[model samples]
Target: SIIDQNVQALFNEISADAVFVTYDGQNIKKYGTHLDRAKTAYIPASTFKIANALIGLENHKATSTEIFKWDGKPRFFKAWDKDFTLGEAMQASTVPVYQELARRIGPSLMQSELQRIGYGNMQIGTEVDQFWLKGPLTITPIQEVKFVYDLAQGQLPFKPEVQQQVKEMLYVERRGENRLYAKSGWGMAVDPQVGWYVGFVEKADGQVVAFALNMQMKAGDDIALRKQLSLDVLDKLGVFHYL
Candidate 1:
């Protein structure tokens, strides 16, 4: 799709360098500035939590209802310093809990699972816990859109129940008859770190719009812009009204 001005203005108004993409089963639409960045790979950050949760469940490293206990170590985000279930940790985007789960899943299985799903570069290296968080593992905004589409449609290469459990964790809210499911991530390890908001809007009549947005998080940028921009672009694309 050609660059849409109204959505591009959304990014220009904030002086943000971002790319937003949406997929409606057959057609993929694009908007925002730095259009080429849509296909450039970057760290997945917490967005990997969705994939991590699916792998954790399939390998028995975690369950949807299993409680993940906190070690009481102070964390940067206060919301994550407590106990949480697999689904709860997904919602809170609790890094520590998922890290622990990753260690339990180990490196081999993580690589295999990522390969099975054709995720990013699929190079986990030897870092069992921090690969997706920093370097050595990355996913493009376009790849994120495709991955979420698979999960949303129960088309991932995993057991039906496992995919179902992970899908439930990404549910955000219901807007009219449309249901929103999403996950946001921040790649803090790189210079001009990137931020991501990727997910889908499933309309009541069975139409699905999978979207992914990532922007350069310059020194003073508000992290909240990731989701806000995604929603605004979707709105401008008539996504909400389509339901």
Candidate 2:
């Protein structure tokens, strides 16, 4: 319908090996990109942290006010080198903080939670940080969409309050009556860059639209397109106007 037609048209202009999915409560639609790619798994990058943060909150291993100490070792993102609270860490997409949280959540609980939620692959591997980034824990765009949809519906087996808290951390931007909550990810560990942007848009009237998109990121690609293309496609589909 409108989603596929507009996205197919938009993908032509963007020109990337990518997949896009937007699920309104009743309809699930994809773009003109390879349908198989949409179903195929890629390293979830930091998007796995969407599930990570939920596990942290559900287990009380991390709290909203407590701080996750910086390791004193600098990283690529200068902003992430300092201490952070749960909310701050999530906002910055601080890899170290979530890595430590993963360590605290431990392998057994993490595996059980992923299984209970039906998250992609559900393999934690042996290491705390490398598993999602390395292998065996990849998630397809379609799987990510379903996970986010269930989170939106408060059906992920976590407490309702835990779902609410994690969703708040995923908040993106707001204009007038529309608010966007999403997470963007890039997997550089493997070839064929795994660029991802996934989440939902909530209208003030209470309608929720869940979405997931992953694309091959070439050397010169503008990483911002991860979020921009999705927003532009929504604009093309009359979603912004619906606000």
Candidate 3:
């Protein structure tokens, strides 16, 4: 009875398995075909940029106004070839800049901060900059939702100001009185690839609902479905009336 029709229909239509979890400071709601997947962990991909930014700022490795200069090397995405402020890099999901930021944060600080946040299994693997993007660092949909919920509430181990700064970077748009903040990620290195859409909505009534969705992606076009499905389920749950 707890399964949501909106989530089931979306997955069924696409013929893909998925897991979506939402939490309002108080209760948790889950949807999708296999609830067990929500508890299973996978690579975080660009979603770790949120944490990277936090570690940079919290440790003084990067300031809010710091400009991440591009090396002029051609990258996977054209938008990442130039300079960017921390917020801009986050919005663009500029991989190289965050990779540099990760190096600047160093393995010790990165490991400690991640542990402080109780993020995933706390395994940074051998590479400081590439762990989340490749292997050895993983997070489940349920964990992601909980992490974002605490972040939205500014209850994480970091300073409230630091958390607020990161929150501002995740802002996507507003619908009616609800403000939506989100980040999308793709775990391209894995077979059957994993896609993610994670973030929260701040309702006009002062309640916050954090959501995380991850699914199997068989082709490049399936990338767009991450956000589409999350928004659809959020809308169906009366979380934001996304339309």
Candidate 4:
């Protein structure tokens, strides 16, 4: 496919720090002047919700329809209002709700779940007080790609029912097409370099393409660049038409 050429062109034009594209579990292409120094360990931000949701569902700690009350008044800076279901929390990227969900599931369980699932670098604090939200939640591009691919293939450490539930929650609704399942993460900037969008596309033929795109910049500077890059990559890979 032209995925490689298109991605290379974008990388060169934008002067991106790193860019990677994979199709059906194969690395179709990648581009960057300094590939080795590209930092993939930035805080995952809310993108960790996928892991949070999976752990919650697998432990029978929560369900997709389960409604969680929002006692902590919504801050003006944050988006959304009122109680949220597990599905809604994830879809909207509700931080408070997810924090509550994480608390309910507890730290020990979250850590264990991640470890059992082959998430070697995912670190959860041993003490509840030590679990700082701003702390980096790292995942390499290779790891992110592998995790989503395994998730699509139903090969995670969770049970079959739990895996099915996770998949169901991640499924994106469309008017007339095969569903798209994805999760995006945007970090609170400690510097100019931190943001990410990672997820997968489920094809009508049952094949899946997983990808992770990370960016680093201030809030006001060209927010559309990431979307444009992602769309261009997808289009080149033949996945844009599916959407």
Candidate 5:
């Protein structure tokens, strides 16, 4: 029967059993599965780019015109082979560029920023360049939503202009009356890849929702499901229908 097969495939596709948690501020609603895992910290993956970009701008190491020039080295993804701005890097979720940004930020400054923001773990270890990757930087979904929610509310340590600039870089898609903005990250540094999609949604009527989702991934998994699965769950909760 259709129901039987559909249920079987659903279990298979979601075998890794990703966890999601979302909080709607304007509506005061909270819902999702795997609520306990929401507090467990894991590699932030590209989602850390959100913080990297903020730090990059704060230190004056990067800019909007052109953040970094390509060095003519080929990376895993051909798209990363070219230069990218802060906005471009955010959209592409380019890892190398952010890694370099982390280097420029250095360990001490990066430490200060992490403390200022109260990011999870906040452990940079000895490797300044790859801390967010392999060293000791791990963030939980619950912390992620709080960070973004503060950014959305202009409550970050930086001025409103800086927070606004960072928020502008996270724009993803617009669905009718609701405009969605989010970032997708895959934890390549960790075995059993960790997928993250964290950001805030803005409704046309001026309401905002912040969310974070993370999933366990195995070899040869479809990375696109990071955001696809997030949207699937949000859709089912009737999250998109409101203001």
Candidate 6:
């Protein structure tokens, strides 16, 4: 498929150690010159927000219409002048608001939910004050793909209502006949920066394509590269176009 070709090109061009791509319920392709030593245990960064959002909705931490004030302070370097809704926050990738929501919900509860969901390697930080840095929320391409497949099948490790709430919160707006939903992540681990884009694409036939990409690089260096890679891969796969 075209996506396989494009991903192969990307891996070659970047001299990347590993690249994993899945489509339509299959680990359709991969490219690499070395074993992926980067453990499945990597900081999730903002992608962890998806888990937080699920906990929020299930516990009534906030409603879809609930509004969060900006506190007039930025949580990350990029989020200074923004107000957020649950939906908009997820879309815009706002960290301050999510951190506040996490604090409100507290670590004990969030850790419980993570463990309940089969996230065995997730560590709940000791300093309740530093919750944002408290994650090495581990996931691999295989694990994430399988988890997403389960999610698409309504088999997530949550109560039915909790799962429904999570689905609603993680939803992306429809562009036309196709629906897109995803979360992107950026973070640093042991001096190496990592980026992630994970989500699913739903087609008219009701089949869902679940995927996750984890890239290692400095925060500034790989932003555009990863975004373009995502668009290019989706387009090549024929799922990039809107109906």
lDDT of each: 0.86, 0.83, 0.86, 0.67, 0.77, 0.65
TM-scores of all models? 0.94, 0.93, 0.95, 0.85, 0.88, 0.82
Which candidate would rank higher by TM-score, 1 or 2? 1
Query: lDDT by residue for model 3 over 148-230, one digit each (tens)?
Result: 89889998788889999999999999998999999999888876688889999999888899999888777646557788888
Q: Per-residue lDDT for 107-139 in model 4, tens only?
A: 778777767786637676564322324553466
Give the top-scoring candidate (TM-score): 3
The residue-by-residue lDDT of candidate 6 on 1-243, one tens digit each, is 765676566566664444545657654443433326233556667777767776777777876678888776445556546667877788787777787788878878878877788753666766432443445455665566566666665777655666565565667657566676777777764446657777777777888877667677664575666656665566666775634
Candidate 2 lDDT for residue 231: 85
Report the Cα RMSD per candidate.
2.0, 1.8, 1.6, 2.9, 4.2, 3.2
Q: Measured by TM-score, how close is model 1 to the native structure?
A: 0.94
Which digits, one per residue and each the tens of the lDDT, describe model 2 over residues 53-102?
88888888987778888878897789888999877777788888888999
Error of 1 at 114 (Å): 1.3
Question: Candidate 5: lDDT of 57?
Answer: 84
lDDT of 5 by residue, 1-243 (tens): 553343234335576655666666543333344545687788887888888888878778877666588888899889899888878988987888888888888989999989887888888898887877774899888888888888877788886777888988998777887777899887777876787888877877777778887777777888787777667656655555423
**Model 1, range 65-118, lDDT digits (tens) per residue?**
888898888888998889999888888898999999999899989999889888
Off by over 4 Å in 4: 1-3, 26-34, 37-39, 76-78, 126-133, 173-177
Q: How close is candidate 6 to the true structure, as a TM-score?
A: 0.82
The runs of at least 3 residues in candidate 5 whose Cα sits more than 4 Å from the true structure, single-residue gaps closed, are 1-13, 26-33, 241-243
Residue 190 CA displacement from its true place in model 2, Å: 1.2
